[PDB]
């Protein structure tokens, strides 16, 4: 599986992915020197969570091409973004390691987060890892790096024994965390990958991502090992929590670098919990935000408290049925027939329990809107640009130049073949459909 | 005459409606199981009088489309809603007799009042019929409702005759107050309604309106005949003057359901009287409406107090002479030129005497708004749209399209004697010149 | 509810119908001289039963225009067809009464039986009502028909009277069958049907139908009464029966030509029972055609046996849930990938308990047919056709001149977005994909 | 240039006009018998100060079509409203002389002050120049401006030559002030203009303007020459400044009539800063505005503060060197690289002081926008459009509807210097850009 993301003289720069699994997209980058493969033992852990596992592997690295040109964080995330863009990802999680974290950062401070719902930073290269006097919380002088760089261009292969020694602490963790297959297979990743790209990858890691910081306006996490021998945590997530305070911060005791593989268990565990906690508050702050537009419809009386309840019934996850619920919302005396059907539309695309009924007829009756021919044609033109459409603020802001006869037909477009379009951008309609009429 | 209000299959559910007279408008809303034909010894008064009669007939009942769907309050306030947006009337007058009464104390509790002047409630439902042990009040049990529904469905013609029987109660008004002629006619209209709606009809008798009734806000009027034996008063009536006191109550004596055409002159009378009482109500109404939009440009002082007095004891109809309010409108320091036009303008059309004499000056330059003939072009055209508008709200929709250029100039047209439109337009007018200064 | 069938020098031809329900098409045509409205106590017991009502009155009679040409059986037809195709009715079911059964012959007769499932023929014209040497069978000669149209021009309202007389029995069943009032009203829609309509049409009873008889190739049911005075029993059902024995023969005791009323509830059960019954036969005559062919997909085993059986537990009509089922189907060992997303297909669409469940991935992925552009191209264009069509024999053989990669790939259109097209139709491509793989 | 602003028979009546220089719109209306071009030294100061000379030449003057109806300023008003409807000027400057005077004063109190900023009126005609019982004020009798009009009538060559005389003063400041060759240009353009139009135009010299006075809500300036011959300073400013005293009132001394031209000097210094003052309070408020855009890129913290202060000291006019301001904007650890190119865009546009050097290169490689050439394309789109505006809420409105690499791109294609459009449409490029980025 490959993306052409570029272009190299007579050859073409394509990326090797993989993309398995169904759910919210959690985007997996790797770093120096391994591939996507190397995250094996996260990516088990996500499948049977329930999320869409994609990895790729970074230019120069991996089964990806090896051009020569283009190894820089502006490139890089120009690459990532075009892996979302040809993926069309919507609401991603985007987990950066190593070389992945500053990918992941310029990604946001470049592209927006308009596809990305959180983030995560294990093992850090945030924010600065050259030591100068203008930031002392350096890792190294530029000298330490230099050095590196001529270490690889003398013996790249040789260079990666001993920087896989500090990689997973070998004189630590061999034959306890990591067994010596492991750590064989690592070497080979290595040294599958590009000769100009090992040696100019170390050049990008003291890139200064104090600008990209604090554009990460999104959930983040920042995870980093203790006994992290090639990245101090000192000098970066130390820091980095400074600047980031809203950023979830955990330490995991005795882990090197490579805490990937010795240390996944704490890792999974840790990073399973943070995105069923951040992922939860989002799915429902477009819950109750959906509530409030759609309780301003119902008139102040015992059914807004009524209504209220049987929503947060559903918000919360308690098991409901639709029939009762359908049949409940007819014979109410002082809800108006076209805010039937607003509920009955609310309560359809709430419930995973569909309860095996193909439709109800009392709502389309009630989406109708007085079956003018004008309005339902303004209805098709609103349908084909909320496909289109990505977030919840793009519905919303489109679905209110449109009268609230257009909105209802369009909902009712919506209520046959749905969908096409996304939920997200379902509730945009209604959240705009509750808003014209007041 | 057809008005749209619903979609059943290939059909659309329209209803008929007549539309007569001019003046203040006046929705005549018919029973069970007549149509709005029905209304016509009202409508007559009501011609005669000066208004404007405006009558349609409910879904499956006269000249109206026979749904199979839909009966229910619910659905005959949105028909009825429908109806006065397409007309687009405001201050209009509800009255409602037999199952209209509860379309009236539905739409006002499930759309307001902002179209609503007042209400009339003829032998009305309100505020229950169906009697539990949570209201005593009722007239008669499920069990009976459901009888007449059986009886329907047995032979609905047959259940006409008995059923006009105890309407007129021709024991005791055929011959004398109705002919066997005008019996033979609502026979018929019974007979040309639709087979679904006698059937569905009764099952909306017993609907409660208990929370619909503390939501009315405008004058109301509770009539109802002593010897009603399809709606007994002592369960009806009696009952509903506890929910809304401040409702004007009248009796007609020995007057049976169908009181329309029996006692047509008692029920003409006392209907002719509450408008005549209710709207007059509303004028001075809208005089205190003008005294609130011309005061929010008058700066806080002694000044702001004497001009509210100065427009009341002219608004109630205490005798004034206008050289003394001309002169001392004249003579003010704090006052801007602008605002003594404004005040001029509402001085000059609501005392009746002039004497006779000459125009004024001051207001004259101020409403003259420096005589431009594209200013007053502006003017004219407006004056065009002015003269063929009729009400309060409908001029002060259209003069809001315009600049604050040319408002001035408009109502220059009107005080500078060239033009002459309605009293209640002119006013419409001096709320939005009133409105521009905000 | 109009629809224009014809032109009349200055005006338009419409005829005024009704359309009630959801489910089958039932199309009721009424006889002479009533109107739509006379099926009322059939209508009710046909929405009971979960049918859809469909009735409109004849050129000439109740609400419906009055045009003095285009009085003929071939003109009936034609008016019949395009209320039909206007409505776009599929498996339909025509039900005639008195000049309705002719309308329902000459429309089988003269455009098919595409849109019709099932007919019946409620006091019936067929098959000659003419005495001639050519046809002794038959009821009287033209000079009593001829003095049937002096009678009507002479005094067409007094001929009313005298005809309901002998059309319920009045002499027999007056009061106890049908009250005073349903006979007024009978005269009522007479009354208000067209003068030069109530002349012509009985010219058309003695239209020869012989040559209509035999082209009815759906299950029909003769029905008629036993006291028919209008419509001899012996010249009419009864020779009727011999040229259709195939027909359901029903005779009622004792009941008058219009035994819609009097001997409605004889009639009611015979014809819900007579429907029950007629179009359970197609329904399952499809599901084990479409079960011929499925079979023929899957080699021969203990599968090709337990399939059938969770195809007939499901024929029949017992409960079975969906998720064991797409699970079973799932970890089936003998079955290929591809027809494991057929069955799963079949699944959908004969269980009425959808089980609340979105929809399957593993079917996905198996109508996938190895994702080839060009074959997923040649599925669109089918799918735009099988929108068109309606019938099984028609799908089938469009998707016959398909690949079997395009059809699965096409019922994957199906799959997702159902639909659009029809189950019939949806048929028509399982018959069809399996078939090609053969 | 012409601008429609009627229509006489055949003929359009147009009005010859000139638009130059960018800022505050000021609108320049001549005196009679000159035209437009009397405006020479006061365009070219104001041009030179920074703002926008707008002059047109009244109906039957200069180089405007020469009717022979509507000479009153009630159609001179009206005139002037089109012109500046049409032409689209917001907080405009209206100043006036000699006859234009009379057009300001008459536009202000017909049409409002929404486009009007300030006004100035140089050798007034306000408030009254006929000498009436009602105001002994006056400059002359009614008997005067006939003898004028009857002068005219004879020779109106001849007329000028006299009226010139006393216009400029030639008894006193020719050779001095004013030479004969530009008093001969004044008489060529007199001559050129309608013949109909000098023999009306007197006849609005007497016009009442007392009830346009009070109306004049904006600041304004009263200016008028103590030799003047034409206008008595004591019957026309000195009783002008009573009525208006809030009005700035200025008096050059010795100066004509024509004081346009010799005393232009002591003109400009009075109107520029006249302009100076009512124009400072609108110069700030857009100033602060694009602060407010601009500062909406830079993240939260103690640099926002310092980034304000580096905006107010530059804003306001203070020195600054833009070596240390693009190094210190270069060498910021959390601005994003993007965001640094606007502030350097931004600090380019506010500083006169290019010091004839070089151009900046960190701004170059964050306006390029990842060089891609579609991206770029869609900014050379948006240039065309950009150098046929004028406005400020004119180029944001228009650079709102392109992406913001376009943005970012067409900012550096006027950066790079390939191409040129104003000051104002600078910012509404920055102002745009930075909307986006949000």
Redesign the interface.
């Known amino acids: 599986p490959f993306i052409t993301v570029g272009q190299e003289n007579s050859t073409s720069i394509d990326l090797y992915y993989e993309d398995h699994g ?1 759910g919210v997209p959690v985007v997996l980058i790797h770093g120096f020197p391994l591939s996507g493969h190397s995250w094996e033992r996260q990516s088990a852990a996500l499948l049977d969570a329930g999320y869409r596992v994609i990895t790729y592997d970074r230019r120069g690295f991996g089964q990806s091409s090896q051009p020569t040109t283009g190894y820089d964080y ?1 490139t890089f995330a ?1 690459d990532l973004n075009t892996v979302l863009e040809t993926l069309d990802l919507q609401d991603a999680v985007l987990v950066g390691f190593s070389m992945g974290t500053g990918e992941v950062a310029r990604y946001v ?2 592209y927006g987060t308009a596809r990305i719902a959180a983030v995560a930073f294990l093992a850090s290269l945030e924010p600065f890892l050259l030591k100068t006097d ?2 002392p919380d350096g890792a190294a002088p530029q000298e330490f790096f230099d050095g590196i760089v001529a270490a690889v261009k003398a013996d790249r292969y040789a260079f990666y024994t001993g920087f896989f020694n500090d990689f997973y602490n070998l004189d630590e963790n061999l034959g306890t965390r990591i067994s010596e297959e492991a750590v064989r297979n690592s070497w080979n990743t290595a040294a599958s990958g590009g000769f100009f790209a090992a040696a100019a990858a170390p050049t990008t890691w003291y890139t ?1 991502f ?3 910081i ?2 990460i306006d999104v959930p983040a996490l920042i995870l980093h090992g203790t006994g992290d021998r090639t990245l101090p945590i000192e000098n970066t997530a130390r820091v980095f929590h400074k600047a980031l305070p809203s950023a979830e911060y955990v330490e995991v005791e005795g882990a090197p670098h490579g805490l990937l593989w010795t240390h996944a268990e704490e890792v999974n565990t840790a990073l399973l919990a943070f995105l069923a906690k951040a992922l939860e508050a989002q799915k429902q702050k477009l819950l109750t935000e959906v509530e409030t537009y759609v309780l301003s419809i119902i ?1 102040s ?1 015992p059914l807004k408290a009524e209504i209220a309840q049987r929503l947060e019934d559903v918000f919360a996850g308690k098991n409901t049925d639709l029939e009762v619920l359908m049949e409940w919302l007819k014979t ?7 805010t039937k059907g607003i509920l009955g539309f609310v309560f359809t695309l709430t419930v ?7 439709r109800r ?1 009392f709502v389309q ?1 009630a989406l ?1 809107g ?2 003018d021919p004008n309005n339902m044609d303004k209805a098709v033109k609103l349908y084909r640009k909320l496909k289109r459409e990505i977030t919840f603020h793009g519905a919303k802001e489109i679905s209110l130049s449109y009268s609230a006869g257009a909105l209802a037909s369009c909902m009712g477009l919506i209520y046959n ?1 749905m969908g096409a379009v996304t939920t997200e951008v379902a509730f945009g309609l209604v959240c705009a459909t509750c808003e014209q009429i007041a």
Chains 1, 2, 3, 4 share one sequence.
């Open positions: 169904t502006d120009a401070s470049s203008d930031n200064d104090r600008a990209d604090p554009r008139p009386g109410r005396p002082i809800l108006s027939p076209l995973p329990s569909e309860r095996g009924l193909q007829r009756n109708n007085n079956g073949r």
